[PDB]
From Swiss-Prot, chains A, B:
PROSITE patterns: ALDOLASE_KDPG_KHG_1, ALDOLASE_KDPG_KHG_2. Belongs to the KHG/KDPG aldolase family. Pyruvate binds at R49, T73, K133. Keywords: Carbohydrate metabolism, Cytoplasm, Lyase, Schiff base. Pfam families: Aldolase (PF01081). The keyword Lipid biosynthesis does not apply. GO terms for cellular component: cytoplasm. Homotrimer. This is KHG/KDPG aldolase. The record marks T161 as: Plays a major role in determining the stereoselectivity.
């Protein structure tokens, strides 16, 4: 897209895993981001699921410029505009709607929107998108669905998210249609509480190393 | 919009179970509704799956003031207007479309529409809705799928329906995202056919009591 | 029925129990493959828009094998629908649906049997007057159980499930009241097609038709 200098494909090809981040306490955002980056995971999906999320995006953008920071759980144009102004470099949505797709394609940052079904994929493709989130992946029919959902759509590429962990992420990464996966396991809620940044860095390092096929 | 004197949330919080009613003979409708009310179940989803359904809603609306009667399997604005005219206090649909969402939100009674995917949830939220049916619940991936679908959406609430029975309804009621559940087991076709209203009352009371804890 | 369609979508699905999902890589294979399928008793040919020669294959089959009911699959938008209609497709199948595709289809001249996975998608198709749908991808959608539940509140709709259907499971679907036929790729194996092994294609079609009987 001539409106998106940073392509959706570039976001998804940066690394094999995109952490789904829920940050309950702002003060933890920056050291969490540094811990991820130290472990080799740079694309951070900061979800709009807590009050401090947008402030977390602004903080990480300023203090951790090697992190590629984006907003998740973006549901509508208002939230998309808010995170764009706050410095999000991309947006992820759990599903798609026409107002959100229209706003995204009119704006400056890539949206990688979730789909569950081929009709939803077709709607996103009608807006010119070719990279999608597959969410919730396990609930959608999993790897077998992508071998099938992605079938008639040889050119479309995905980031599956939802019920993915070290036990199964390789099953997804093995697919030609999959560029990367997402999951919350890299930033456990209690690790942030405990200031266990070492644990976060280790999970990141393990996830990247464990991804080599 | 302000348009609904009865909120969707009030329909879903009246009690833990909403019977999915399929009534083939009109003469059965009023005694069936009375039998449910006697068992403590008083939100009655009369599905538009039989010729007599709208007449059944009309009769129950007039004769059983201790029940709140509504219509289910409402597919389109034509049906919505019919059940509104007949005295339905709410409408349930198995999925959603924009013409149905527009007509409902512009109209006088709450619509609780089914969804299966997050995109469908988001389209409903674009029309201001926050209470949905999760249908067909077991075919949508059950409790786990519902937990994943509901996760990015802390505020949304559900009524799962489809494949729910005493064997599994507590699993759904245990979830923070669930207000009540729907099921056809409270009004079995053979009970209606045999005029066993006593058994309907017992099924209703068993359901209500079994929902506690 | 749809005022602009000379052929009903229902008639497409009631032609036979099995609709082959065809991926044709080289044009010269298209006509003999079509004749081989017809000779095995299978004549509704879903030529998917997954290869460069697909549209020319539809045109060739429409010309040389007019006794086949040839159509186009993997139709994703109004442009592709118009293109296949001009080529001689007698119907169109899509893996999913969108409002622009539904609108173009109902204004156009050939039946569209579009894929759905959820009841909201079914309801959108129904808003356009459609009653015949594909259920895709069937097995990953949750198979016969899913289809049973989804089809429940919808007694008049009929389906063609496609996606993971095989001789192992197709009778499971064909036994359902809501199912008229199924789609499958096993009748036209890629290697048979490239090898020009047409007797094998005929045998597989004949076996599929006989095995469909309940």
């Amino acid at each position: 897209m001539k409106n998106w200098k940073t392509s959706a494909e570039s976001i998804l090809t940066t690394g094999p895993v995109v952490p789904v981040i829920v940050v309950k306490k702002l003060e933890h955002a920056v050291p969490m981001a540094k811990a991820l980056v130290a472990g080799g995971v740079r694309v951070l999906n900061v979800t709009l699921r807590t009050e401090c999320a947008v402030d977390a995006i602004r903080a990480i953008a300023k203090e951790v410029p090697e992190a590629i920071v984006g907003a998740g759980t973006v549901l509508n144009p208002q939230q998309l505009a808010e995170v764009t102004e706050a410095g999000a470099q991309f947006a992820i949505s759990p599903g798609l709607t026409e107002p959100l797709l229209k706003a995204a394609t009119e704006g400056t940052i890539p949206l990688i929107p979730g789909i569950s079904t081929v009709s939803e994929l077709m709607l996103g493709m009608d807006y010119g998108l070719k990279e999608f989130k597959f969410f919730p992946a396990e609930a959608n029919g999993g790897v077998k669905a992508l071998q099938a959902i992605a079938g008639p759509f040889s050119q479309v590429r995905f980031c599956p998210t939802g019920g993915i962990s070290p036990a199964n992420y390789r099953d997804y990464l093995a697919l030609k249609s999959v560029l990367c996966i997402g999951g919350s396991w890299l930033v456990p809620a209690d690790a942030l509480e405990a200031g266990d940044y070492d644990r976060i860095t280790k999970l990141a390092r393990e996830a990247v190393e464990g991804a080599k096929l």
